Design a protein around this ligand. Structure first.
Ligand code: NA
Lengths: 266, 34, 13, 88
């Protein structure tokens, strides 16, 4: 379907990235840059194993520590999806995305550690559980067997679209009596604000059954966006786009609509 | 097909053309020789 | 009736 | 301006003598966690988990105010704490 094509286009979204080793990192020799197509829907610490291996090779063994990344001085939070970080921070700059690789001086004030793959899974499932609490009072996610939870995770970590959506489609359903989710899982990000993001309760269907739009959402929770562009998965949807449809088709695998508000470029 | 949906599909394809398609071969070729 | 956390932290653990 | 939070122990985790607290909306889950640990005279090496809706564990950088506005009810946010995982 046209809808299914959108799901695949979202899922397989890629950002061309140039990983360069921090110029002041202490090394035995100079490291070449490493180029990679990064998946928008995933997390840095899940897909940069080859980057890590590449740059560890020039480090003294004792100087190897937890790897971290920054964009022009801004540490990159691994628990934020890759596409969101790029949209928010670098989408106005020329490609490829220039990420600087670090080992020394992990900035604990700006970043959460990622001590294991399990921490990534725990984070991912926690996001999905939060999303379903909003959408179904957790009824769908809790009715699932643990093997289904695993399948969702494996589909993300191994880039298996059909494997993931065989389960995720259930999380995109809603009661027959209804015409949408209870509340839409969304977060609105804006660099100029102090708060990390805006997240509020917003119902996707009006009392008369009509579908609320992206424009309606913004008027309610972020009037200061209507000079600024609204970016989701690197594109700018029309404000008349129904929110329920967006939630179903343009959410990340964590079932959240991550929305960036960014200055209009020139 | 509603205009808002057409718009989204078109913009995703353009995004993919400019961001992925334009870089995939040179990035692969770079890694090949790296 | 809720205890003020900011009060306790600044009072003495 | 501050929000009311109620803390409930899961399983054999120690019980806080004082459970109802008023906290700044900008306080994070980690800030909340650090307070409980030294309130229960626990230690850093000991990990402590926090749960919303008896369902999910929010990221430790999440702010309580947002959680309250989304998952609060009857004027307060209920959070469960546990020395071990409870809900995955
Ligand atoms: Na660049």
């Amino acid at each position: 379907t046209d809808d299914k094509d959108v799901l695949r286009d979202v899922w397989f979204g890629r950002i061309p990235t140039c990983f360069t080793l921090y110029q002041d990192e202490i090394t035995e020799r100079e490291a070449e840059p490493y180029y990679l197509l990064l998946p928008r829907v995933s997390y840095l610490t899940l897909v940069t194993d080859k980057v890590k291996k590449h740059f560890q090779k020039v480090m003294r063994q004792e100087d190897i520590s937890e790897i971290w990344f920054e964009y022009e001085g801004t540490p990159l939070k691994w628990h934020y999806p890759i596409g969101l970080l790029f949209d928010l921070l670098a989408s106005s700059s020329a490609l490829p995305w220039n990420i600087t690789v670090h080992f020394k001086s992990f900035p604990e004030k700006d970043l959460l550690h990622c001590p294991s793959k399990d921490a990534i899974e725990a984070h991912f499932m926690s996001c999905m559980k939060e999303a379903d609490a909003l959408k179904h009072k957790s009824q769908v996610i809790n009715e699932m067997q643990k093997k289904d939870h695993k399948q969702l995770w494996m589909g993300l970590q191994n880039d298996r679209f059909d494997q993931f959506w065989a389960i995720n489609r259930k999380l995109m359903e809603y009661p027959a009596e209804e015409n949408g989710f209870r509340y839409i899982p969304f977060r609105i990000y804006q660099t100029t604000t102090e708060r990390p993001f805006i997240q509020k309760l917003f119902r996707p269907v009006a009392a008369d059954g009509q579908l609320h739009t992206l424009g309606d959402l913004l008027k309610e929770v972020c009037p200061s966006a209507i000079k600024n562009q609204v970016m989701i998965h690197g594109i700018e949807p029309m404000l008349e786009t129904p929110l329920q449809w967006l939630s179903e088709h343009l959410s990340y695998p964590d079932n959240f609509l991550h929305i960036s508000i960014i200055p209009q470029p020139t | 097909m509603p205009r808002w949906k057409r718009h989204i599909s078109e913009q995703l394809r353009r995004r993919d053309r400019l961001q992925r398609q334009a870089f995939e071969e040179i990035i692969l070729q770079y890694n090949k020789l790296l | 009736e809720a205890a003020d956390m900011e009060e306790y932290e600044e009072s003495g653990l | 301006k501050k929000i009311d939070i109620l803390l409930k122990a899961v399983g054999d985790t120690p019980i806080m003598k004082t459970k109802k607290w008023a906290v700044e909306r900008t306080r994070t889950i980690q800030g909340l966690i650090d307070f409980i640990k030294k309130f229960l005279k626990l230690v850093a090496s000991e990990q402590l988990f926090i749960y919303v809706n008896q369902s999910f564990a929010p990221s430790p950088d999440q702010e309580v105010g947002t959680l309250y506005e989304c998952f609060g009810s009857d004027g307060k946010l209920v959070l469960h704490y546990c020395k071990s995982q409870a809900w995955g």
